[PDB]
Amino acid sequence: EVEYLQHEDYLYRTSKLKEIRDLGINPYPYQYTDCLEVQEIRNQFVDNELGDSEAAFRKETPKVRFAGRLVLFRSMGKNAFGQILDNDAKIQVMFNRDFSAVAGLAADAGISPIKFIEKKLDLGDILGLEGYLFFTHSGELTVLVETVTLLCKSLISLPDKHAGLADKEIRYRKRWADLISSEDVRKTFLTRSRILKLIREYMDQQSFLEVETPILQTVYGGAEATPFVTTLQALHAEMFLRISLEIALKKLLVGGMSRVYEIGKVFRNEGIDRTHNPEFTMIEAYAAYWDYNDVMKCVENLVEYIVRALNNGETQVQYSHLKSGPQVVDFKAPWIRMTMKESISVYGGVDVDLHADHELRKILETQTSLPEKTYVHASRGELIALLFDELVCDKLIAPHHITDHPLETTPLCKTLRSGDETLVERFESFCLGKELCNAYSELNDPLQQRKLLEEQMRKKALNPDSEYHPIDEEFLEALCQGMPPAGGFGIGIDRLVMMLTDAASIRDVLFFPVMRR
Amino acid sequence: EVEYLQHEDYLYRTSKLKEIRDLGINPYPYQYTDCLEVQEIRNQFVDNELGDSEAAFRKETPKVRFAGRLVLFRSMGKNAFGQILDNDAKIQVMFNRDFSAVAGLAADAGISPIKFIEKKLDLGDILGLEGYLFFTHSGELTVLVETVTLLCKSLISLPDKHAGLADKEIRYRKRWADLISSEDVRKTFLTRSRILKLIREYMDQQSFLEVETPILQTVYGGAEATPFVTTLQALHAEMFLRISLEIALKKLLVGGMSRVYEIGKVFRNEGIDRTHNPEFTMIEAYAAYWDYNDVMKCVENLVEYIVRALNNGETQVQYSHLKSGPQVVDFKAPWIRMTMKESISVYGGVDVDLHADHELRKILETQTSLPEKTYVHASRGELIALLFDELVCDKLIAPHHITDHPLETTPLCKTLRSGDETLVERFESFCLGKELCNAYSELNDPLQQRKLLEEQMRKKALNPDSEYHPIDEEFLEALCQGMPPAGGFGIGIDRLVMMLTDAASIRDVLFFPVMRR
Ligand SMILES: Nc1ncnc2c1ncn2[C@@H]1O[C@H](CO)[C@@H](O)[C@H]1O
Ligand SMILES: Nc1ncnc2c1ncn2[C@@H]1O[C@H](CO)[C@@H](O)[C@H]1O
Ligand SMILES: N[C@@H](CCCC[NH3+])C(=O)O
Ligand SMILES: N[C@@H](CCCC[NH3+])C(=O)O
Ligand SMILES: [Cl-]
Ligand code: NA
Ligand code: NA
């Protein structure tokens, strides 16, 4: 049920439409040409020795044309004052009974321009303003309006400027009301767009080529996640939405492209929380002839570059929403490097290699809240990965690279070049307690790759709930063609944006996050 | 059934893995440090003074490191010559019995470096090369190799050069093989990446902000297309993949963002042909206070800019694949502009407003192959659009903007400012007989918007093949909040890429196009 259709404001505003048309005025006209942005006007004349209001009345000061939403209005008799919001910038306007005209309002109309402005316009209407600049004596840049043009008649009132909890929840769907009302929300989303641009700048300077690969595939992989499934009618075929970019980009390495990246939507059909939306944006990037130590430098340099460009060359950022209180994190490279084992000793208090497997499980029972089913029959590598999750991850506030993970954690990474085949040359980057990056010395031994994908699914099929996952033969054939040694990474871009915009929730960095009905 | 695992060449290549490893050489090593690109090497010394082969043997010429795939090889006794392919650039290599060492091959090994190169390496292997540059007597850039490093032992041969129908059809799946064997394929996809980068540069310069909006939504709209459907588990909810970008971006204009664009995947669950893939890339862009004439200029200027950047300032492009023979088209702005009615006269030979509806029907009956069901009861506006489809569209070879479409073709556009409410301020741009762009003076009268969507719903209720499609109430509520007058366009980027890379099919501009099983 659409409630506003019976609201008093909607009925009152719509009844003005016929009145305005009867005056010969189109309430939804076609353009407003030669229209400067309020912010460009500010930048052009704020540092400038403009006249006072009487100079504007004398038409001696600069004449400007601009447009925006009427967000404040006060009638003062012969004069009226208002505020126009244009694309995150505001400017004061002044209407005068003698000076101001309404476009399309005939001289022999039954209503004066100033009365039209008071009675037929409303807060929320979009207006085109042409007039003369001046400074109030308080220094407020103001426009004496010579001609006002109605550009859009709004039919509901402005949103409440200061949302309580319930209004905020609705504005995650009705995002336009958030963008109208909140300077902070507007700035968050402008910064997000700048971050995406800075990423492309950095990768391009490093000679990576940006590509696109399919979201809809007959397979899925390159991560551990439940997929979305859909039906292609033309071929009467089930398709998956990709859970990662990895396999497709690796095929491009085989194809001879030495440095590729993609910034794209990936889809994981799982739970929704402060750091998880089912549709999210990743960059994956791959450079032939690199290993994971090369990738580590690329990832920290990328993030430092973004932060410096946003914060006047500074590398420190304030984040306010951790349960432990406000933090300052420094993204200056190099970030801290630790092995997973080292991080469990330093932050967890457990030297993993001094304990047998049986002793590790007792620590998990006593020092964590993991259910017995999680660790009762897990392997040594799986137990180490669990100790990290529970005793370490939350403590990684400053930027950390965590290196050398158990082989169990992934089938797509080479093992340690030293010969230790129980650990892989993987790292995950953490900041503010949350995972930010995943990177490998990429596996390109086709026989070893097949064996790990075979051993993975035999283990994955041990759980009766994991959807069966057939081996991606096309990928193995591409590796037989020959993939160069390579180093690759994947960064959750929404999470990066949260850290850099002081966003408490991923819902704050997506225009339209997934919401309950 | 994987055929190559039973092929002789797979046995031959895999059998060398043990032999190479028994010599202490890792066939899949971890990196190749400080590796220059062959293109960068060519840029630096091709147009430069360089020594001859004897200078290289004296180690007086520039020393370089690079890597790539061995794609030609010929032994001449003590010398051997080959070609290395690195990301669409090639360089010749020379090996010599006394000068060239193999990384990790011991002196007391049982095989000589030259014999290892001849016998343990194969075409298709990925090699790291360190050596000295020189020019052959014929002037070809060559590297006398001081050390070769095996970076990847390929287990299958280079792709066959003899393409057929069966061969090239598999290449659309096994794209890595296509990329290795075909310079034209590599250049097509390199050009595609440049086009995307050029679009972003142009749009950014016009002050459009790049945004992302969601692919997965609870509604679909903004085009006439069958959607893909999927299921979001966490909410037990049916979702649609978007069929266009339009509604989400319009909501951002309501929110106060003056100029936005998105380059994103959209999904239309329909048929496959030379200009349709179910997943394709669109740019949509919206500018407040513009109309369709402003957009027309923006579109043709955007495309002219792209063409000039790719073609050293020229605006003419050759396209080879039309049934009418090769064409030259000129993307120079301004493009030809005609109304739909004018184009039916100029190209179709019909002057529509001299004819009654029943004469239009009789023209469709006798001059086209449309089934009678399509026109026997169609409205005048629908008859005009069918006359354009059948008698005009294929003849629009040079770039055209076709303006002022019947109202029936879309519910999202303003009618003509002249007061002719049977036509809308829409244009579609055509080149080489195909639609390139769709653009509007955007409809922002909420009452008129609801009326047109209701009329569409009433019409679709009569077609038993289409399921009920509820009106988007959130979109209508945003329009009530108030959208500025605006102009928007959507361009099919894959079709633009086809036109600028002389691609016969959309399958030639997607790395992994949708393929029958
Ligand atoms: N559902 C999700 N929402 C947001 N970011 C995610 C999600 N799942 C994973 N990520 C991010 O993607 C990266 C690569 O897996 C992770 O390190 C994490 O930052
Ligand atoms: N299935 C498709 N594949 C590729 N491009 C398409 C497809 N459908 C429409 N387009 C492009 O999208 C634009 C907007 O509808 C069209 O002008 C056309 O260029
Ligand atoms: N596909 C990985 C990112 C790249 C990992 C390194 N190859 C992920 O989703 O986590
Ligand atoms: N949504 C349109 C493109 C924009 C049309 C102008 N608002 C389409 O898919 O064709
Ligand atoms: Cl509250
Ligand atoms: Na016929
Ligand atoms: Na129907």
Whether A134 and A200 map to the same domain: the answer is: no
Phi then psi for B409, rounded to 5 degrees?
-80, -10
Residues A183 and A44 in one domain: no
Which protein residues have their CB within 5 A of the ion that is ligand 7?
B 460, 463, 466
Question: Of the bound ligands, which one is closest to the alpha carbon of residue A169?
Answer: 5
Q: Which atom of ligand 1 lies closest to the CA of A496?
A: 19
| Domain of residue B241, CATH code | 3.30.930.10
User: Using a CB-CB distance cutoff of 8 angstroms, which residues of chain B are in contact with residue A247?
Assistant: none
Last residue within a domain, chosen from A160, A187, A217: A160
Contact A401, A429 (CB under 8 A): yes
DSSP state letter for A347:
I
Instruction: Tell me the residue length of chain A.
Output: 517
Min Cα separation B84/chain A (Å): 11
Cβ–Cβ of A37/B151 closer than 8 Å?
Answer: no
Ligand 4 pocket, Cβ-based, cut-off 6 angstroms: B 222-223, 244, 246, 284, 438-440, 442, 488-490
Judge if A396 and A504 occupy the same domain.
Answer: yes
Task: Classify the C-alpha dihedral A378-A380-A381-A386 as positive or negative.
Answer: positive
CA distance A244 to A286: 13
Q: Are residues A193 and A168 in the same domain?
A: yes
Q: Do B185 and B119 lie in a common domain?
A: no
Of B393, B351, B343, B346, the C-alpha closest to B368 is B393
Q: Is the distance from CB of B505 to CB of B170 less than 8 angstroms?
A: no
User: Can you tell me the distance from the alpha carbon of B27 to that of B288, in angstroms, rounded to the nearest whole number?
Assistant: 59
Ligand 2 pocket: which of B199, B494, B496 to mutate (most atoms <8 Å of CB)? B494
Closest C-alpha among A499, A513, A514 to residue A188: A499
Separation of A441 CA from ligand 3 center, angstroms? 11
Report CB contact under 8 Å: A211, B189. Answer: yes
Contacts of A248 (CB under 8 A, 6+ apart): A213, A214, A217, A242, A262, B511, B512
Pairing mode, if any, of strands B79-86 and B89-96? Answer: antiparallel
Contact A61, A133 (CB under 8 A): yes
Secondary structure, 3-state, A40-106: HHHHHHCCCCCCCHHHHHCCCCCEEEEEEEEEEEEEECCEEEEEEEECCEEEEEEEECCCCEECCCC
Whether residue B509 contacts residue B188, with contact meaning beta carbons closer than 8 Å, is answered with yes
Residue A1 lies in a domain: no
d(CA A410, CA B495): 39
**Residue of B150, B40, B56 whose CA lies nearest to A444:** B150
Work out how many domains chain A is built from and give that number: 2
Determine the Cα–Cα distance for residues B448 and B469; give it in Å rounded to an integer.
Answer: 18
Beta bridge partners of B128: B67, B149
Judge whether B444 and B486 are in contact, CB under 8 Å: yes
Is A3 known to sit in a ligand binding site?
Answer: no
- Compute CA distances B358 → A34, A247, B351, B379, B439, whole Å: 46, 57, 14, 10, 31
What is the C-alpha separation between A109 and A508, in angstroms, rounded?
48
d(CA B308, CA B317) in angstroms, rounded, equals: 10
User: CATH code at A39?
Assistant: 2.40.50.140
- 8 Å CB contact between A370 and A390: yes
From the CA of A355, how many Å to the nearest CA of chain B?
Answer: 31
Nearest alpha carbon, ligand 1 atom 3:
A276
Contacts of B258 (CB under 8 A, 6+ apart): A37, A86, A87, B207, B287, B288, B289, B484
What tokens were used for A401? Answer: 């690279």
Numbers of helices and strands, H then E, in chain A: 16, 19
**Dihedral pair phi/psi, residue B279, rounded to 5°:** -110, 125
Q: Is position A435 annotated in a ligand binding site?
A: yes
Q: Take residue B145 and report the two structure tokens written for it.
A: 């190799």
Can you name the residues that pair with A131 across neighbouring β-strands? Answer: A64, A145
A156 plus A194 within the same structural domain:
no
Q: Per the structure block, which two tokens stand in for B415?
A: 């009618």
For ligand 3, atom 3, which residue shows the shortest CA distance? A490
Tell me which residue range forms the domain holding A59: 6-160
- Looking at B111, B132, B160, which one is the last position of a domain? B160
Residue A368 in any domain: the answer is yes
Reported as half-sphere exposure (CB side, CA atoms, 13 A), residue A307 has a value of 22
The answer to whether residues A141 and A201 belong to one domain is: no
- The SS3 call for residue B357 is helix
The partner residue sitting opposite B512, judged by closest CB among A174, A248, A517, is A248
**Residue A137 belongs to some domain of the structure:** yes
Q: Given 3-state DSSP classes, what are the helix, strand and coil percentages for chain A, each rounded to the nearest 5?
A: 35, 25, 40
Q: How many angstroms does the Cα of residue A6 sit away from the middle of ligand 7?
A: 30
Q: Of B127, B172, B140, nearest to B35 (Cα)? A: B127
Q: How buried is B461 (Cβ within 10 angstroms: 0-12 exposed, 13-18 middle, 19+ buried)?
A: exposed
Cα end-to-end span (Å), chain B? 14
Residues of A in contact with B444 (CB under 8 A): 28, 152
Is A438 in contact with A426 (CB distance < 8 Å)? Answer: yes
Contact call for residues B311 and B502 (beta carbons, < 8 A): no
> Alpha-carbon distance A304 to B53, whole Å?
46
Ligand 3 center to A283 CA (angstroms): 9
Same domain, A141 and A167: no
Residues B328 and B295 in one domain: yes
Q: Would you tell me how many other CB atoms lie within 10 Å of the CB of residue B244?
A: 22
Put simply, the answer to whether A156 touches B241 (Cβ < 8 Å) is no
- The answer to the question of residue B347 being in a domain is yes
Q: Choosing among B7, B43, B87, B229, which should be mutated to test the A contact, i.e. which has the most A CBs within 10 A? A: B87
CA-to-CA distance for B133 and B136, rounded, in angstroms?
10
Identify whether residues A124 and A211 lie together within a single domain: no
All residues at 6 or more sequence positions from A391 whose CB lies less than 8 Å from its CB, including other chains: A344, A347, A348, A349, A350, A367, A368
- In this structure, is residue B496 part of a structural domain? yes
Does A318 reside within a domain?
yes
Beta pairing class for A237-241 and A279-288 = unpaired
Q: Is-contact A93 A145, C-beta < 8 A? A: yes
Indicate whether B1 belongs to any domain.
Answer: no
Our answer on whether the CB atom of A378 is closer than 6 Å to any ligand 3 atom is: no
- Resolution to 1 decimal, in Å? 2.1
Q: Are residues A74 and A184 in the same domain?
A: no
Which residue on chain B is closest to A493 by alpha carbon?
B212
Record the tokens describing residue B226, joined without a space. 């069958």
Answer yes or no: is the C-beta of A488 below 6 A from any ligand 3 atom. Answer: yes
CB B486 within 8 A of CB A223: no
* Same domain, residue pair A277 and A216: yes
Cβ distance A235 to B294 less than 8 Å, yes or no, reads no
Name every chain B residue with its beta carbon within 8 A of the beta carbon of A125.
482
**Pick from B264, B265, B480: CB nearest A155:** B480
The whole-angstrom separation of Cα A102 and Cα A113 is 6
At which of A135, A160, A185 does a domain end? A160
Taking CA–CA distances from A479, the nearest residue in chain B reads: B154
Find the residue in A nearest to B9 (Cα): A480
Distance CA(B332)–CA(B144), nearest Å, equals 48
- Cβ atoms of residues B269 and B280 within 8 Å: no
A24 touching chain B per CB within 8 A: no
First to last CA, chain A: 13
Tokens of residue A79, six digits: 């004069």
